[PDB]
């Protein structure tokens, strides 16, 4: 259905221990495709997906140049925010930035993002309207004033609606085997005694792409959201995702419980019983 491209930037000041550590990663949907680390030997933007490796030197030289610029902006940004917040020259701070675009099923522009956090709190964010800024505090109101003076929102909007979606579409085509795959989950169920008088049913979804999944337990078709053990969807580390949900079943109530699995890769949702 829908798709997204995201860039994530982390800059971390290490005062007295040289220049700040800057790390960048790019994703299409749940798939990493690029990285940059200020500390690594290459000083290159580097591929992390097979389907981007074949981009020629022009692509890589251009991404390297930009990521280096983004790195340098964050270096300055760490100084600015220090000033803004009247904070000690020594002390480690984190500047984070994310930007990217959503396309619908028709691969047309759906939403754009451009936002920052300082030390893990919201600093500034482009609003859904793609023209106004949310400024948390008075510090951000300074950024906001500057960006409003400079019509930053308009220039960004151009990227978000043009390049961002252009190159997302291009990547989805070039990575069609990986990026346009729906891998339905491999499911199974386990049963372990907890005591003389109650046992765990654990319902497993494995090896599925993308990460989006609905995994629920019903007792006589009534949902057990309050009584379900449900882990964070986690990466298997091969491009696929894992999840399970568990319920404690009192003795001889197994037949009352149904596991329901929903995923894009499933034509119709699974009901599983012990």
């Amino acid at each position: 259905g829908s798709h997204s491209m995201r860039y994530f930037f982390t800059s971390v000041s290490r005062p007295g221990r040289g220049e700040p550590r800057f790390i960048a990663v790019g994703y299409v949907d749940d798939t990493q495709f690029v990285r940059f680390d200020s500390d690594a030997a290459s000083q290159r933007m580097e591929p992390r997906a097979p389907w981007i490796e074949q981009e020629g030197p022009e692509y890589w030289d251009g991404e390297t140049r930009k990521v280096k610029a983004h790195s340098q902006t964050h270096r300055v940004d760490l100084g600015t925010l220090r000033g803004y917040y009247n904070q000690s020259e020594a002390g480690s701070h984190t500047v984070q930035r994310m930007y990217g675009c959503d396309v619908g099923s028709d691969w047309r522009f759906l939403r754009g993002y451009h936002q920052y956090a300082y030390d893990g709190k919201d600093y500034i964010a482009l609003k859904e309207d793609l023209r106004s800024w949310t400024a948390a505090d008075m510090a951000a109101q300074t950024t906001k004033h500057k960006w409003e003076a400079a019509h930053v929102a308009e220039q960004l909007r151009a990227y978000l609606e043009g390049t961002c979606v252009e190159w997302l579409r291009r990547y989805l085509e070039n990575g069609k085997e990986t990026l346009q795959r729906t891998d339905a989950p491999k499911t199974h169920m386990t049963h372990h005694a907890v005591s003389d008088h109650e046992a765990t049913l654990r319902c497993w979804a494995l090896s599925f792409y993308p990460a989006e999944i609905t995994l629920t337990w019903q007792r006589d078709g009534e949902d057990q959201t309050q009584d379900t053990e449900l882990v964070e969807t986690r990466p298997a580390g091969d491009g696929t995702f894992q999840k399970w949900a568990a319920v404690v079943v009192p003795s001889g109530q197994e037949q009352r419980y149904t596991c329901h699995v929903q995923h894009e890769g499933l034509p119709k949702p699974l009901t599983l019983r012990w």
Binding site: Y7, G26, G62, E63, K66, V67, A69, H70, Q72, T73, V76, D77, T80, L81, Y84, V95, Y99, Y116, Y123, I124, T143, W147, V152, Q155, L156, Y159, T163, C164, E166, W167
Partner: peptide, 9 residues
């Protein structure tokens, strides 16, 4: 593709 503009807080 990264946004080619330099932007500072």
């Amino acid at each position: 593709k990264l946004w080619a503009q330099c932007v500072q807080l």
